[PDB]
Design a protein around this ligand. Sequence first.
Ligand SMILES: *[C@@H]1O[C@H](CO)[C@@H](O)[C@H](O)[C@H]1NC(C)=O
Lengths: 88, 170
Amino acid sequence: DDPLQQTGQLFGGLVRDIRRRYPYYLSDITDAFSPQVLAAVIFIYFAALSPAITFGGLLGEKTRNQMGVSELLISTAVQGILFALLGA
Amino acid sequence: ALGIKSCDFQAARNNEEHHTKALSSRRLFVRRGQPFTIILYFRAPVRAFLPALKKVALTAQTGEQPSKINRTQATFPISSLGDRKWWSAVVEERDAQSWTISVTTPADAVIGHYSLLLQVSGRKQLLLGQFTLLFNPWNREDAVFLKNEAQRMEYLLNQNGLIYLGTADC
Ligand SMILES: *[C@@H]1O[C@H](CO)[C@@H](O)[C@H](O)[C@H]1NC(C)=O
């Protein structure tokens, strides 16, 4: 099975990928009980928070404070949870 | 969640029933028009049966350039009900890890070297094995069908013959 291929059906890639991936949902749920996952979480938390604050400060000082740090943080959280739940 | 470990063509079991015991004991030679039993081995036990039965099917391929217009290619699913006069396959015995399938073959098929393939709904096709198809006088629906049994023994399964020479007197 190829993840990428031309299919003569409209939206064929979407259905092919969902049927390829989604039966692994319980496996994805169960494989996260190791402490290495906790270490990765605590690492990536800072690794993603620091560039967020830096870019938020620069962006806020650039656009006359119309959009700032809190908006960037909440947006990052929103697509993070959404992509974690519904991502391939 | 489904993975096939290996397939076992029960050659030594159905080769004597197909009268091909003298031909081989490891390779699988089958006669057309007669069902034969094979065994499939899973990697993990199946949670549900019918949903797993729905999304898997198997094909038979033969010749250099197979096609459905030359009758050199066939596709059929693993179903509990179907036409017995064409290609079909029904599960006879179910285990936690293994299935026993009974494949049926049409009484009018192209002979030659065959290959069996299995297709998963998401994953690609996988080759299970190879077998050969031959005519049989034991099938009532075949063009070559011998009513007598001793005639079958003499004219098909015998290997020691006699050739008559000399004049018409001796
Ligand atoms: C908020 O926007 C108004 C309207 O342009 C502006 O006068 C004010 O300075 C802004 N506040 C900031 C940049 O803190």
